[PDB]
Amino acid sequence: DPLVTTNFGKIRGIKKELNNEILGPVIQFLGVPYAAPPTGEHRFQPPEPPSPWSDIRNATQFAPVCPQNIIDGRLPEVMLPVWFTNNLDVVSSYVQDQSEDCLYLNIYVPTEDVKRISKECARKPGKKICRKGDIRDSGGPKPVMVYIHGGSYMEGTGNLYDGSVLASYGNVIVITVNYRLGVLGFLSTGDQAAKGNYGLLDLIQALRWTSENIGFFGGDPLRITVFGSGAGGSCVNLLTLSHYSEGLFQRAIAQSGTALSSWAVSFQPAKYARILATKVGCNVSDTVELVECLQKKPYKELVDQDVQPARYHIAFGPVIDGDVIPDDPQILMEQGEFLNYDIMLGVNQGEGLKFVENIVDSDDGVSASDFDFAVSNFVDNLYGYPEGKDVLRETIKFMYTDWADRHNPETRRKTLLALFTDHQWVAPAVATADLHSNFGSPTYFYAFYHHCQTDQVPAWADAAHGDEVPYVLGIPMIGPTELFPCNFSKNDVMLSAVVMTYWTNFAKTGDPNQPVPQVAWTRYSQKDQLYLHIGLKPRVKEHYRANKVNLWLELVPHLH
Amino acid sequence: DPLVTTNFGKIRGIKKELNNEILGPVIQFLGVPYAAPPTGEHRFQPPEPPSPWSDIRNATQFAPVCPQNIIDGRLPEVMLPVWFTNNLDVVSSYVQDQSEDCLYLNIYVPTGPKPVMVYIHGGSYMEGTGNLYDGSVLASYGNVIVITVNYRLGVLGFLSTGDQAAKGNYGLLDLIQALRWTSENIGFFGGDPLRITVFGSGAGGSCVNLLTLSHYSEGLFQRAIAQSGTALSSWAVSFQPAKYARILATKVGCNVSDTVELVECLQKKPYKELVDQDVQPARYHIAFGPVIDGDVIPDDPQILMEQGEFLNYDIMLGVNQGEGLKFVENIVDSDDGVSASDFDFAVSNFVDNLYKDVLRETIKFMYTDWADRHNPETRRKTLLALFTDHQWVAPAVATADLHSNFGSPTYFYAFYHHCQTDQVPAWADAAHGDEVPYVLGIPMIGPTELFPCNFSKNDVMLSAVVMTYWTNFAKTGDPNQPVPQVAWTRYSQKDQLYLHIGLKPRVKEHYRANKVNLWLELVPHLH
Amino acid sequence: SGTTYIFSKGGGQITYKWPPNDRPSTRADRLAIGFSTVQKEAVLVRVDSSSGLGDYLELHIHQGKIGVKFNVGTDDIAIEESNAIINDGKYHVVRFTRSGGNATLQVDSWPVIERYPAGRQLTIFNSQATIIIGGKEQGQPFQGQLSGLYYNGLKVLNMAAENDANIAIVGNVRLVG
Amino acid sequence: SGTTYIFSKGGGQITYKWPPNDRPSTRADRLAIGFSTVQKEAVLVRVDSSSGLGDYLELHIHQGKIGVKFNVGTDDIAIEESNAIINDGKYHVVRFTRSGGNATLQVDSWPVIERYPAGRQLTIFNSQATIIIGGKEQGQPFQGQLSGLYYNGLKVLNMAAENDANIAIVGNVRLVG
């Protein structure tokens, strides 16, 4: 009987029992409408608040997901979580139900049977405490954790991430959000015709609703924590930079995703807006006419298009618009032009598994020649062509040749994988933790070393990109799922508990160590660059990959 | 009556009692004439065999040294050993008698054909003497015969005009003639002519390597040890000898059109006038020294070692980890550090000395320890490491890579223990030529004037350990055999195994691999 | 009639110290204060960012005129009630706002003063560590009365009187009431 | 003759391997061997540098004529007794000397062939490791008799006659007397 009356009308949740000795029940409000449909006249427009209902709508089933095209090959594996790629047939089922009217939330609320006050009132209704009281049986507003799913801004759905275990483990309310993706959510003609960042503006509208309504479910609109991974980790960072985020959240976690990578912002929104129009017969001279017709076209025709960008970049995604995103994220962060939030950033040992998992052989090595080509492919796709081709290629190659073991192609495999890891993930993440520390935001940093290798993951591989997700979400707590089908061990269960303790402790206190105790994860500052090495043997260590992070931050920008 | 009958006549020596109870006697033979006086028409000419004397030569005090100018601030401080720079006044004692007729060696015989260890000195090819090095302690300690040799230095021994007028490499040729005399005569003293080992520090370490690359030296020595010294360092070979010869010639009224009359001019003039002369090269390079003559040195020491153009010699190379202190010291404050702006400048003209914008930046990056980014004590250590690596460590590891790959039992070492002295700054690591007092076994006889540091029990027990490796190598071609002592593994480019010599002696992997290869594999082809 | 505190002989200081891990940043700043003084030179309220950062806000009196000087990243920005002395011993309320580079300043109920700095200006006041009331240590101590101080939501003088854990009053400051 | 080893039906091999820590390099080479054979083509003696170095010496009968191919780094240098037939069954002695890139070869009482290859070339035969006599695992095994083998002071066939620690004898090979 879980009825809750929000500002917009009553909604009915569905109680969900959990299948683990420990964890207790969770009432989950699925498909909750946080914004009015961005359909028709409202396509390519910021989200409006939802229309109030006077009935009782069943928030018990998943609402449709935002329009996306899921096809092997036509999506960039080098970018999406490794659990996401290797298991697409499982991801299809979450996304087969589709609509443009897709702006929805899932709310995961932990429920105890402990009757704190209701039983005193059953004995004595007369006292003010009950006579006109506000304290509930589960008294004390619970910290809110909003997860922003991030693939490549083209696909995905919060519905993929079951917050139940993470909710009823840290006694927090976990929320998962649907926001506009693909073209629908990020098309920009580079002006006022289409301003881009619609998806972002959805997330902001989500946080508006949540900050206005979570109180009813028993949430604390002052202890809200946005967290994300992959591109959702980028959204987390892009939101800390957005003026639109004042008062809407207070603490942020970004997992293997910064606003600084070459694929977090679309730097040519108009180039790709107009290429798409060409594919649907809408490439007209004036932009507003071009967007005019794009609104008349059925979303499916738009989402079905093959709009490939250059490698490790995006075609549709967040744009620097001087509104939602005020300036270039590098400028905004070098000058410290951001409000203060408790941050917790982090990266995995081998994010860039999918950057090598093609040229690695049966004895799992990479040839001297295979290596030289891969860096050349890397340089020419990411840093362009002329200006300083040779001086850049030769430097990177030198810095990614382990010289204590130069000839063995197995360790040559590792470093090649490190190149893409360091460059796309560690460099920007360590840069962000640096620039947040300086301007007095409590910063915390982690490395992720422990994976759960399946039967699709090559044995040699360490923790892949995204591999950290199940532990954050407490999947090992309820056994293997169809989405994360790894045989989680006792050791995997222990770690997944430990990550969750921090991840909630942070949402509770903004300090991963307190209150729930477990090696104390010390704070991070540019001074000693202190990070927690999360794995089977956890340590707080210093200066993560310091000599490689700075190669890219300091030396390389001088080499053009 | 210490008396030995040799090929060139009969020679008498002196018996030094050592400054220690443990160590036993050594018969010394000082100022032994190994070659004919290189004067007259023999100056700027190859060394001649010495003439047989009829009587008994009173060879019991040193012989005069080769003509050399020794002044504080007129010599390349950065290039010469540290004990040399800091102790110039005491050094000058051994440099008081200077004859042009100076081709003499000194023999130390302990009291079986004992192994022969020839010591080649050398700061910058301009100055120095074997008389500085007391091969006494090393001798009766390892039961080896030790020899310290004098060779034509400065102009008098390295002048080339780039043709047959002046061929150069006379110094090197004198060393050859020394080894000629040695393999023929050392038998009369009780030496093994088929177990001769040439060893040296500084340029004297280069000379060792330079002899390995010369076809002349064949069948005269079997083993070789180079200390903080290479044929590959920027200052190891003079590439423009005729340039300087003509610049020297202008300073003494000899600069004539024809090269043959310019050489006959300089011969006629007094030796003191040419030596006192003020002639200096672009920093880190040299005016006078070994030249590529196409005869002694057939080609560049770099080409010849990639070609394998050398016989298989038992090589032991090495560097100390604070080599180029002299580069960095002169910009260190009281807080024992170096400022960021002083670091950026030093690098800049380091490039303007030896090499543009990218190189200026790479080095600057490579030598920043981002673990302690801002601490000027750290920013001192790595700026020190810059010159340490580029002038000593890089050439040394280059040689050992090219020697082990062409099948020669190579052994590499890092010497990390400095003698504790107030002569140098406290923060200091082992400086260029700090391994000498250990090799020569000075800690055994206490402090001398030339090495005045407060010697400790640990310095003596390290000096014993080193002298063991050093003698053992001269005996067997293997620092582990035959004297019992962690075994010094043979070096090879697969695992680059070197002995990390110090208080805690240990065999380690790939010495400074990531920085060494910067200079050997990234920097070379950046243009 | 705010929470009146009297600053006396020689001078004094009442200090706010935001807990380390909750130091605010901001785009806009609201700050109002009630005062009576006769001083020609004084610093009344100074807001300082964590060490290293340059960001500062100062409400001061120079040659009788009241003003506010602040740097949030680029330049020091002045805004001053230019045309009337305020050190006349009578009661006065000064209200100062800030948004990005710009500022607003009103004394009692005169025309509102408006400052708009030329050139490209930064907007964020970072990690504010301390509010310093009384200016004793800046260099010019305050002599006079200060009442009900409002700053970005915080009633500093009230919570100062209400025995705040983070308020330190040291010097010749006394509580009226 | 010196120490004679017969090489029989199907051929054999005698392999001397230099101890690792004493692998010799050289500028001038002396190589002498007495022999008797009927082979039109066979490989008598091959000296190899260590694995990685392509430096070799090969004494080989080709077309019925004795000779030596060798390379020290630059070019493959050939020298042979071209004028006469050497596989006649009679006991012949061939002497080979190698001064740098230049070489001379003589057989019996016959005129001495001189070979001087043009263009600058390397002189050093680097770290020599194995001497192979009979070359069974080379293509053409020797069939006949080899006696008195000199390579730079090494009496290799006499060494195998008094059980030297480095030499192996695999294949049809017998000692004489």
Ligand SMILES: *[C@@H]1O[C@H](CO)[C@@H](O[C@@H]2O[C@H](CO)[C@@H](O[C@@H]3O[C@H](CO)[C@@H](O)[C@H](O)[C@@H]3O)[C@H](O)[C@H]2NC(C)=O)[C@H](O)[C@H]1NC(C)=O
């Ligand atoms: C996930 O990992 C667990 C932990 O290793 C796996 O459980 C283990 O399964 C194996 C068989 O696959 C069991 O081994 C057996 O042991 C018995 C004695 O108890 C022996 O008689 C058999 O010869 C056999 O080797 C093992 O007991 C069992 N361990 C436990 C108690 O968990 C499990 O297989 C994995 N999950 C799956 C099904 O993928």
Ligand SMILES: *[C@@H]1O[C@H](CO)[C@@H](O)[C@H](O)[C@H]1NC(C)=O
């Ligand atoms: C669309 O039309 C415009 C204006 O004629 C043209 O500049 C642009 O290149 C066209 N886009 C494509 C990709 O065809």
Ligand SMILES: *[C@@H]1O[C@H](CO)[C@@H](O)[C@H](O)[C@H]1NC(C)=O
């Ligand atoms: C010396 O004189 C020669 C011949 O006249 C001339 O070529 C050269 O420039 C002079 N060299 C120097 C540097 O004195």
Ligand SMILES: [Ca+2]
């Ligand atoms: Ca600022």
Ligand SMILES: [Ca+2]
């Ligand atoms: Ca060769």
